[PDB]
Amino acid sequence: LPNDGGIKLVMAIIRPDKLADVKTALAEVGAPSLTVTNVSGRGSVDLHQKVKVECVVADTPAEDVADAIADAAHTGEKGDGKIFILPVENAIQVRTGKTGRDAV
Amino acid sequence: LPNDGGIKLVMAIIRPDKLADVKTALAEVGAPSLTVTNVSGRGSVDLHQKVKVECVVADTPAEDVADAIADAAHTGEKGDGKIFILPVENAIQVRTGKTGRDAV
Amino acid sequence: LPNDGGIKLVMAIIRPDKLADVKTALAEVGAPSLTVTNVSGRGSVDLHQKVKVECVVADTPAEDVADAIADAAHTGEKGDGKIFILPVENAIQVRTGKTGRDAV
Ligand SMILES: Nc1ncnc2c1ncn2[C@@H]1O[C@H](COP(=O)(O)OP(=O)(O)O)[C@@H](O)[C@H]1O
Ligand SMILES: Nc1ncnc2c1ncn2[C@@H]1O[C@H](COP(=O)(O)OP(=O)(O)O)[C@@H](O)[C@H]1O
Numbered sequence: 001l002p003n004d005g006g007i008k009l010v011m012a013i014i015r016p017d018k019l020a021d022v023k024t025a026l027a028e029v030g031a032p033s034l035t036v037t038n039v040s041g042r043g044s045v046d047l048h049q050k051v052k053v054e055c056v057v058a059d060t061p062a063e064d065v066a067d068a069i070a071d072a073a074h075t076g077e078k079g080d081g082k083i084f085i086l087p088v089e090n091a092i093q094v095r096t097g098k099t100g101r102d103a104v
Numbered sequence: 105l106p107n108d109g110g111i112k113l114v115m116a117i118i119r120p121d122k123l124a125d126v127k128t129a130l131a132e133v134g135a136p137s138l139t140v141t142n143v144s145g146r147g148s149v150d151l152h153q154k155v156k157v158e159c160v161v162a163d164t165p166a167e168d169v170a171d172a173i174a175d176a177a178h179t180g181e182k183g184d185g186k187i188f189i190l191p192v193e194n195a196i197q198v199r200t201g202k203t204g205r206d207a208v
Numbered sequence: 209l210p211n212d213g214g215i216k217l218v219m220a221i222i223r224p225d226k227l228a229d230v231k232t233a234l235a236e237v238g239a240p241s242l243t244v245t246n247v248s249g250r251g252s253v254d255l256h257q258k259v260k261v262e263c264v265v266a267d268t269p270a271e272d273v274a275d276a277i278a279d280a281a282h283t284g285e286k287g288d289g290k291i292f293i294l295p296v297e298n299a300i301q302v303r304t305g306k307t308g309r310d311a312v
């Protein structure tokens with residue numbers, strides 16, 4: 001089963017102007033759900049405007065979601081950002097109180 | 105021991121108007137500490153205003169904290185949000201430099 | 209190898225006025241990359257302004273990065289904040305599509 005039967009958090013920091021394309025890519029890969037945070041950052045003094053996108057996934061392989069975001073967020077210039085995958089141990093839907101991988 | 109002797113991050117995305125009730129519920133369950141982030145999101149094009157609540161816990165079972173948030177954040181309409189539990193490997197209190205589960 | 213050959217997320221919640229000193233400390237320890245989020249919180253009703261700093265690390269020990277942040281963020285008064293270390297399972301550089309610990 002995808003994600004070894006578990007749940008993963010895909011966290012991407014990307015350019016603000018690529019958010020629209022990332023949203024479209026996520027919808028197209030079948031994992032439209034996302035939470036966006038406005039952030040500031042630097043990679044390798046003054047911080048630049050960035051966007052954090054978070055997608056918790058279970059049914060869709062986390063590497064597939066990461067690839068979709070990366071392809072949509074890419075420009076080829078320094079500052080394009082990074083995607084990280086973190087383990088999630090449980091999930092609860094607030095509306096129903098449903099828990100586990102099927103809660104999403 | 106609670107949380108199998110470890111530390112967990114409870115991350116909830118909820119409606120902004122439910123934050124006050126969630127804060128009260130967290131205080132009542134004995135885990136008042138929280139960090140709030142203003143975010144935007146969609147579940148299953150335009151993003152809606154949401155709130156992210158993060159609570160790192162050790163002494164209080166993470167599922168108890170999650171249940172408290174879910175009950176307070178519930179309305180029964182689509183958009184109520186989700187709660188995720190993630191593993192935390194260590195914690196440090198900045199004021200004292202105390203580390204581990206007792207750092208909170 | 210550092211971080212047991214893996215990748216870690218160091219997440220710190222600190223006073224806003226300490227961000228400049230934390231940035232300098234991170235550069236000095238050799239891990240300048242960071243993402244900053246403006247947040248609100250309380251520790252142990254009204255929430256106070258705080259800053260969340262996130263640093264994903266592989267080459268630099270996560271406890272070294274945490275110590276650098278803690279020392280720079282310290283004042284000795286309640287409200288100084290906390291640092292948490294979370295596991296990260298994978299990373300992707302958007303610009304190159306490079307993956308794994310060497311993606312950072
Ligand atoms: N290791 C990291 N930890 C936390 N945030 C990072 C990390 N690497 C990159 N970021 C975030 O992604 C943004 C762009 O990073 P990146 O494209 O690596 O910058 P650069 O090309 O200048 O090294 C940064 O401004 C920061 O917000
Ligand atoms: N799998 C997920 N990953 C990231 N964020 C999510 C996920 N599911 C829900 N969210 C967040 O919670 C909010 C409300 O979600 P939800 O109640 O599931 O919406 P819906 O009922 O329309 O499917 C979303 O707008 C988003 O911010």
Ligand SMILES: Nc1ncnc2c1ncn2[C@@H]1O[C@H](COP(=O)(O)OP(=O)(O)O)[C@@H](O)[C@H]1O
Nearest residue numbers: 137138139159160249250251252286287288289
């Ligand atoms: N267990 C926790 N979970 C989530 N956020 C926390 C936690 N502990 C502290 N914080 C964050 O760090 C900030 C400062 O915390 P802290 O210095 O512990 O406050 P206090 O000294 O009043 O207990 C809080 O306002 C909150 O944003």
